[PDB]
Design a protein around this ligand. Structure first.
Ligand SMILES: [Mg+2]
Ligand SMILES: [Mg+2]
Ligand SMILES: [Mg+2]
Ligand SMILES: [Mn+2]
Length: 325
DNA sequence: CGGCATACG
DNA sequence: CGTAT
DNA sequence: GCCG
């Protein structure tokens, strides 16, 4: 089992679901406390389990797995022995975890904001509603739409939004294309948002494109909230006899950078962090969603596909559905 | 012990 | 500070 | 929290 998540296939569904879910609770809790290093290790350990070809049934099977030391091993041992890990349950129950989770779920609210509210004694969404002078306009949007935004988006919904985005993109810049990215591209059947990457086969034609797109969507009455290269929107999505609010991200990249932006926006988030860490630490190359830089020759790699990028970095190619780290 | 991904709004 | 993978 |  290789040490970096980008060195191994990680399928969407796997054989250690409960074990990985428990470690991810501890990862999430570490994040709420600002402990990025611990969050990372628990994320990585959970990910290793996702990559295994069968269930872990005995403690000895963790021997030699990367990212399993005393703490993560003890968590797994308790689950294997008792079906429950006391630490994990204590986290789930805690007022601090439940409130930070509730608050950070709000669009416009991050760990730092949630934590300050927690410290001020706020606990519920209605606490926030009953003091709206303290909220940014983004936070007000996130709070108004919070219920709809907590409902899973389905693949059927995604096909509907794509047609709608293509229509606007087509008027804004004929020839421009729209590609579905994020979790849906990795094969997820549900999600909490939809991500699209927009480009044009003629380098440079995509300059200034996003505002033209947004103006047209807004003119069609489809935008409940927004507001460059990235747009984080709330869209109005038709439902039988009604509609619901859905988070949609729109991103534009020039065609030269498209493989890099596709790779970055397809995720998973942990996969991309690991891929960038691998690039920098193992290959001495600097990767981002725009390109891949050799800081010794001071040159950028041209890529025509994601395949090219995996080859540049000396990694076996993984399709999106195996990037579910 | 240092490091932990790397952007844009 | 927020957002994204 | 763990790796190198
Ligand atoms: Mg939030
Ligand atoms: Mg997404
Ligand atoms: Mg997501
Ligand atoms: Mn998104």
């Amino acid at each position: 089992m290789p040490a970096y998540a980008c060195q191994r296939p990680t399928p969407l569904t796997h054989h250690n679901t409960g074990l990985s879910e428990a470690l991810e609770i501890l990862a999430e809790a570490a994040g709420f406390e600002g402990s990025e290093g611990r969050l990372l290790t628990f994320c990585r350990a959970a990910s290793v389990l996702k990559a295994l070809p069968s269930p872990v049934t005995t403690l000895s099977q963790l021997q030699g797995l990367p990212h399993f030391g005393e703490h993560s091993s003890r968590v797994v041992q308790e689950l294997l022995e008792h079906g429950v890990c006391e630490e994990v349950e204590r986290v789930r129950r805690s007022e601090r975890y439940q409130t930070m989770k509730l608050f950070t779920q709000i669009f416009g609210v991050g760990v730092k904001t949630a934590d300050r509210w927690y410290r001020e004694g706020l606990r519920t969404l209605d606490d926030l509603r009953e003091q709206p002078q303290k909220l940014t306009q983004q936070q007000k949007a996130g709070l108004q739409h919070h219920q709809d935004l907590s409902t899973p988006v389905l693949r059927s919904d995604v096909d509907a939004l794509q047609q709608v985005v293509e229509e606007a993109v087509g008027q804004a810049l004929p020839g421009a294309t729209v590609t579905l990215t994020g979790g849906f591209r990795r094969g997820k059947l549900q999600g909490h948002d939809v991500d699209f990457l927009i480009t044009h086969p003629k380098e440079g034609q995509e300059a200034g494109l996003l505002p033209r797109v947004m103006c047209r969507l807004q003119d069609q009455g489809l935008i409940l909230y927004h507001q460059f290269e990235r747009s984080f929107c709330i869209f109005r999505l038709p439902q039988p006899g009604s509609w619901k609010a859905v988070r949609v991200d729109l991103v534009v990249a020039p065609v030269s950078q498209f493989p890099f932006a596709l790779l970055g926006w397809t995720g998973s988030k942990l996969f991309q962090r690991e891929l960038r860490r691998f690039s920098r630490k193992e290959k001495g190359l600097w990767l981002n969603s725009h390109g891949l830089f050799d800081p010794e020759q001071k040159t950028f790699f041209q890529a025509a596909s994601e395949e090219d990028i995996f080859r540049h970095l000396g990694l076996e190619y993984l399709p999106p559905e195996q990037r579910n780290a």
